[PDB]
Design a binder for this molecule. Structure first.
Ligand SMILES: NC(=O)N1CC[C@@H](C(=O)Nc2cncc3ccccc23)c2cc(Cl)ccc21
Ligand SMILES: NC(=O)N1CC[C@@H](C(=O)Nc2cncc3ccccc23)c2cc(Cl)ccc21
Lengths: 305, 306
């Protein structure tokens, strides 16, 4: 019993975190094999950030301008190249702690663990979701750039996020490990804002199933709904549209609890229209949307890594 | 910016998790140096659990009755002893991944990270608090026994909890790494129940200071309170009494925000009376009590968003 916002064990990623320094700027890097990946903005001064020409800033740098520190050991940079918004520093030593890994680009609504780092040293791990507006509500301070997001599938770490910046509302923006931003953001100090966010409907439904599995059923009702009538309600409450794919993905949870997906949608419709009436679900007075259907199945079955 | 329920990076603890098997029972063990620590109930059957005589069950065991598996490697047990509710299995190999560590017994209100494990394999990491009723609201399934709680301040792992059992309300009970249970619990299947739980007042105050540091002040008011009047109101909402130690502990956060501890207490009193009126504090519609003053200072900026 119990249901917690659970992150993947971070050990496989901790063994990849390094400190990258270029001039006065210090941030985090991910050392996999003989390459250190980090935000390309490590080569910018505060003035350069206003309007950077990264290829031009980079051409003025040599390998020795990049100081890479792995624990108390200095790695020597033997090459450098840029791929989108990530700088790839070729080093002379392959990381002996390199896990089995892949670079994957995730979709909004998908969750991942973040290993927050400062000066190449891991400070904490937390779970978050890629919001529909492509931001993450992370917890990051100055120096956290280069911290990464990941999932683990069996023994393979799938790196999906690298931290680049904080937006004016305190939410965060970053890229996949190929340097492509999630969202309409750029790595420059200019007017940028998170668009209006929405609630990840399939995740709220998954968490309602988790609540039922954990013995919380007060919100269940005798009613069902059509997918179109539910979607009319979702649009009204700034909830993401629910698709037939979402319904299919919730099939296993629907079988385990005996509550049809559209039957759980009728419960959600009622919660949106009336509130919780002083009650809580899994210790929360808000409808939680940062657990996917897979996260719920994994936590309610004890999958190991 | 942002405020998350943040766990310590679990790598240092992952390298210590092993699987311990005694007969038909399999659970997790913590391998530090040449010793594997695990719940003594690994030597019990379901039948034994009503009134087990651990000394009598243990005397019937030899070293080779304990199967310890570290990854795909079997460790050889060369000794065993019981210390309170923990079994200590001496093995022939010192764990090469043993971090710098200490065993610390925590007080209610303290937080820690839990690395939930099954069959000696880590499954997930989450942040927990020792409830005032000495239980933890964990996420644990059968096979999770032996999973540990810890803090990692200054590269040293302070192990503070080892999971032993789930109570009828779905909450969890365990011991420190010396095998002393937290709370009035025993490693017996008996009519045991968590006492009435309360809210960790000093932690709610800490999290209100975190909200002020991060830029939110909507809940502040022009009032103050005496410590005694605060406790008289707070106890009516099942909040733990706030002591002078808690007021002293909140000193640094009070200095950083410029809000006196008793002025933050007045805000808390008003929040208990009014609720949030559709508003949230750090993304929550409930008053959060699983962040200590130390956790807030660790996570939050040293510069308040004025
Ligand atoms: N506005 C500006 O010039 N900057 C700031 C530095 C960095 C930036 O957002 N880092 C930060 C990341 N996460 C948390 C922080 C919490 C406080 C401060 C910075 C934080 C950044 C990066 C890019 Cl790609 C663009 C702009 C900027
Ligand atoms: N009542 C009883 O016979 N048992 C059950 C087994 C074990 C026990 O609590 N394990 C479990 C631990 N954590 C989560 C679980 C979630 C579902 C099931 C078990 C779980 C246990 C241990 C002690 Cl010290 C005393 C009694 C018992």
């Amino acid at each position: 019993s119990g249901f917690r916002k659970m992150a993947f064990p971070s050990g496989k990623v901790e063994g990849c975190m390094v400190q990258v320094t270029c001039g006065t700027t210090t941030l985090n890097g991910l050392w996999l094999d003989d390459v250190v990946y980090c935000p390309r903005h490590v080569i910018c001064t505060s003035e350069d950030m206003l309007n950077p020409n990264y290829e031009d800033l980079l051409i003025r740098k040599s390998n020795h301008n990049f100081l890479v520190q792995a624990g108390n050991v200095q790695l020597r940079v033997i090459g450098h190249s840029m791929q989108n918004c990530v700088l790839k520093l070729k080093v002379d030593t392959a990381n002996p702690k390199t896990p089995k890994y892949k670079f994957v680009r995730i979709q909004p609504g998908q969750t991942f663990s973040v290993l927050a780092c400062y000066n190449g040293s891991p400070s904490g791990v937390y779970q978050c979701a890629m919001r529909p507006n492509f931001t993450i509500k992370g917890s990051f301070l100055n120096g956290s750039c280069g911290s990464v997001g990941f999932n683990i599938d069996y023994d393979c770490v799938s790196f999906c996020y690298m931290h680049h910046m904080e937006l004016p509302t305190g939410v965060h923006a970053g890229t996949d490990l190929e340097g492509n931003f999630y969202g309409p953001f750029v790595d420059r100090q200019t007017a940028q804002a998170a668009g209006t966010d929405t609630t990840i409907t399939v995740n709220v439904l998954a968490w309602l199933y988790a609540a039922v599995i954990n013995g919380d059923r007060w919100f269940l009702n005798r009613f069902t709904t059509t997918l179109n009538d539910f979607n009319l309600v979702a649009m009204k409450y700034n909830y993401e549209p629910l698709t037939q794919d979402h319904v299919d993905i919730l099939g296993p949870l629907s079988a385990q609890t005996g509550i049809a997906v559209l039957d759980m949608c009728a419960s959600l419709k009622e919660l949106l229209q009336n509130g919780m009436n002083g009650r809580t679900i899994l210790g929360s007075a808000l409808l939680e949307d940062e657990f996917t259907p897979f996260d719920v199945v994994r936590q309610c079955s004890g999958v190991t890594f």
